[PDB]
Amino acid sequence: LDPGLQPGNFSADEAGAQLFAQSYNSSAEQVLFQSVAASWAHDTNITAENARRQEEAALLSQEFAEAWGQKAKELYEPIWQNFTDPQLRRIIGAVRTLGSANLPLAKRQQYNALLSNMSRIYSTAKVCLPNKTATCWSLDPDLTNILASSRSYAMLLFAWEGWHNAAGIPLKPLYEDFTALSNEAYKQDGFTDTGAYWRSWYNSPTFEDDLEHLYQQLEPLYLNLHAFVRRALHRRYGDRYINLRGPIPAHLLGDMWAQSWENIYDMVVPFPDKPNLDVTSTMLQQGWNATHMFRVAEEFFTSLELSPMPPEFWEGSMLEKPADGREVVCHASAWDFYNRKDFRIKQCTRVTMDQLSTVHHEMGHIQYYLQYKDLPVSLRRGANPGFHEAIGDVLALSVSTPEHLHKIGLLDRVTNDTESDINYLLKMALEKIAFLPFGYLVDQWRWGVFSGRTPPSRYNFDWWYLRTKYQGICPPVTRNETHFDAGAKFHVPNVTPYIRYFVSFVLQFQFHEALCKEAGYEGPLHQCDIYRSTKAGAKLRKVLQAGSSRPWQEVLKDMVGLDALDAQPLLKYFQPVTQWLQEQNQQNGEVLGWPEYQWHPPLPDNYPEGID
């Protein structure tokens, strides 16, 4: 690289191990800005030129990272861990770990290539109809909408199978190779496999257990939401397609991965004939740009005594699927350019409630950025990945309240009663409860792939073991070890850790409680709305401004009063419907779980030649 980016020498002393770092930070944000802006061009525009570029920028970083990497350890290793200012012993500790950059040049290029590609294969795939080579559907929007609102078994089946073959099969060979490399890289940095490296980020020698336990506490919650919906579904598709004693077919839950069922609310809503808790409809009625959405999400944040979106963001941002036709990574994501000036969001936005919360979710990342920019490089990265995924969801909780919505125009009217209360709680259950199993499962599968528990020889066989086992869902068509359904999930191909969405979902309520308390709210945790609460917001920002400077376990105590993750405040949120569902299944003689595992639905009638 430039040499004015290379280390320099420093002292084997602390007062000079600190001098090692003030430097790295000034240089690092040049090298980081580059690699980041490069990607921003590849994702905003997926072209061979941009990809080759991106792969280049990565190569620079990879060895900017090696230079200071091997240097930081050259002389700061056998004494670190005894550094008075550990808010620093942990920056040096972040630098001493390179990862891939401990990979010979050839392998690094292989590495970066795989990445570029997988994301391309994943984001480029499509589903085409049989006889008519007529317009081929894409995951967003076509496929998504078909799942979100089509009630044709066969049709959903065509898209579920279409997408899973189309995205997975080609992806498999690359994945196996990316894993071998990723491993090799961190086997250097001390860990055993990338798995261990990924879960060393919560600093809890007890992490996995704490999670397994925390799940048991919630499993009952899921199992009941499950049997309840499974039966509402039986009601609509019949006895041939649904088994009241078996796992649910993975394509009927209204979402490609069956990770959230809030899109079938109209089929399970307990007390219908009441005001609809779905302004998935009056957002359209009104006159709503995709921008209008990033504007309302904004306005909550302001009110919350927190900074608004910078002007750079408002323009260095992609909030709609472009018109120049430029194949893009439509996923929603938030970008931190490490230059304290450029922060943007990338997402192919269009007008659904479901996505109006995703917008908040994303703003949560941006707001976290804006808040901790004023610290070093090797800690921007918050308490733990969990806290990051939480920030926007918390504020989302308050927004979802029917009552919060009326205050802002999408819930015309009012009934502050039980029935409506149950409906609301069920809707939220479809979104947060139904996810818990999945969120847990994914990295469950991966830590095992990274560890060799699950060789490519059992990629799909161990994936459906986990899916059936936790979600109680089964594949609508047969599968084998030419398939790679794990790869059809945006996060597997783009190598993003998942166990943080679990942590996130459990700990977004701890926040919601803690915040509602300081807001001075009293009434029911699930009707609280920390709106316009400068008092609450100040409590949140203190955690934000903290980044990775001290331990999450401490930043958490200060904010919530607890040394760790707790499902208690979550149980307390859903309490009503928790008891309600439980009572309804029993009376209706339901069976919690799937004892008839191994059961699979039959294909439609002559598949595949239908309405599609």
Ligand X SMILES: *[C@@H]1O[C@H](CO)[C@@H](O)[C@H](O)[C@H]1NC(C)=O
Ligand Y SMILES: *[C@@H]1O[C@H](CO)[C@@H](O[C@@H]2O[C@H](CO)[C@@H](O)[C@H](O)[C@H]2NC(C)=O)[C@H](O)[C@H]1NC(C)=O
Q: How far is the CB of 51 from ligand LPR (least distance, A)?
A: 15
Q: How far is the CB of 332 from Zn ion (least distance, A)?
A: 8
Give me the residues paired with residue 343 across strands. Answer: 336
The 8-class DSSP code of residue 141 comes to I
Encoded tokens for 510: 């701890």
Which helix H or strand E contains 333, and what residues bound it?
strand 333-336
Find all residues with CB under 8 Å of 86, minimum gap 6, and list them.
none
Query: Does the annotation count 362 as an active-site position?
Result: yes
Taking a C-beta distance cutoff of 8 angstroms, is the pair 157, 127 a contact?
Answer: no
Query: Which residues in the chain precede a discontinuity of more than 2.5 Å between C and N?
Result: none
Q: In this chain, which of 254, 382, 385, 402 binds Cl ion, going by CB under 5 A?
A: 385
389 near Zn ion, rule: CB under 5 A? yes
Site string for ligand Y, 465-484 (x = CB under 6 A): -------------x-x-x--
Closer to ligand Y by Cβ: residue 343 or 463: 463
Of the residues 55, 161, 362, 590, which is catalytic? 362
Residue with structure tokens 């302001």?
302
Contact stretch for Zn ion (CB under 5 A) within 9-17, 389-397, 509-517, 572-580: 389-397
Q: Of the candidates 235, 258, 198, which has an alpha carbon nearest to the alpha carbon of residue 443?
A: 198
285 near ligand Y, rule: CB under 6 A? no
Is 202 labelled as part of a ligand binding site?
A: yes
CA angle 426, 360, 51 (to 5 degrees): 120
Is 331 labelled as part of a ligand binding site?
A: no
Q: Of the candidates 313, 297, 507, 305, which has an alpha carbon nearest to the alpha carbon of residue 396?
A: 297
Alpha carbons 473 and 466: distance in angstroms, whole number: 10
Query: Does the annotation count 419 as an active-site position?
Result: no
What SS3 class is residue 384?
coil
Give me the residues paired with residue 138 across strands. Answer: 126
Q: How far is the CB of 396 from ligand X (least distance, A)?
A: 32
Q: Of the candidates 378, 477, 519, 398, which has an alpha carbon nearest to the alpha carbon of residue 168?
A: 477
Partner that binds at residue 385, options Cl ion, ligand Y, ligand LPR, none, CB closer than 5 to 8 Å by kind: Cl ion
Q: How far is the CB of 120 from ligand Y (least distance, A)?
A: 23
Is 500 labelled as part of a ligand binding site?
A: yes
342 near Zn ion, rule: CB under 5 A? no
Closer to ligand LPR by Cβ: residue 25 or 333: 333
Q: How far is the CB of 493 from ligand X (least distance, A)?
A: 12
Taking a C-beta distance cutoff of 8 angstroms, is the pair 256, 160 a contact?
Answer: yes
Taking a C-beta distance cutoff of 8 angstroms, is the pair 178, 111 a contact?
Answer: yes
In terms of C-beta density within 10 A (0-12 exposed, 13-18 middle, 19 or more buried), how is residue 608 classed?
middle
Taking a C-beta distance cutoff of 8 angstroms, is the pair 521, 404 a contact?
Answer: no
Is 365 labelled as part of a ligand binding site?
A: yes
Is 483 labelled as part of a ligand binding site?
A: no
Contact stretch for Cl ion (CB under 5 A) within 262-270, 500-508, 549-557, 587-595: 500-508
Residue with structure tokens 């979600």?
471
Taking a C-beta distance cutoff of 8 angstroms, is the pair 10, 74 a contact?
Answer: no
Contact stretch for Cl ion (CB under 5 A) within 260-268, 403-411, 449-457, 494-502: 494-502
Alpha carbons 541 and 330: distance in angstroms, whole number: 30
Chain positions contacting ligand X, by CB under 6 A: 22, 25-26, 29, 110, 113-114, 117, 376
Chain positions contacting ligand LPR, by CB under 6 A: 331-334, 358, 361-362, 491, 494, 496, 501
Of the residues 164, 491, 512, 526, which is catalytic? 491
Partner that binds at residue 495, options Zn ion, ligand LPR, ligand X, none, CB closer than 5 to 8 Å by kind: none
Partner that binds at residue 500, options ligand X, Cl ion, Zn ion, none, CB closer than 5 to 8 Å by kind: Cl ion
Compute CA distances 53 → 42, 57, 58, 105, 235, whole Å: 8, 6, 9, 16, 53
Closer to ligand LPR by Cβ: residue 161 or 362: 362
Contact stretch for Cl ion (CB under 5 A) within 323-331, 377-385, 422-430, 573-581: 377-385
Q: What are phi and psi of 53, to 5 degrees?
A: -60, -70
Partner that binds at residue 423, options ligand X, Zn ion, ligand LPR, none, CB closer than 5 to 8 Å by kind: none
Chain contacts with Zn ion (rule: CB under 5 A): 389
**So which residues are the catalytic ones?**
362, 491
Chain contacts with Cl ion (rule: CB under 5 A): 385, 497, 500
Instruction: Please enumerate, by residue number, every residue annotated as part of a binding site.
Output: 202, 361, 365, 389, 500
Chain contacts with ligand Y (rule: CB under 6 A): 478, 480, 482
Instruction: Please enumerate, by residue number, every residue annotated as part of a binding site for chloride.
Output: 202, 500
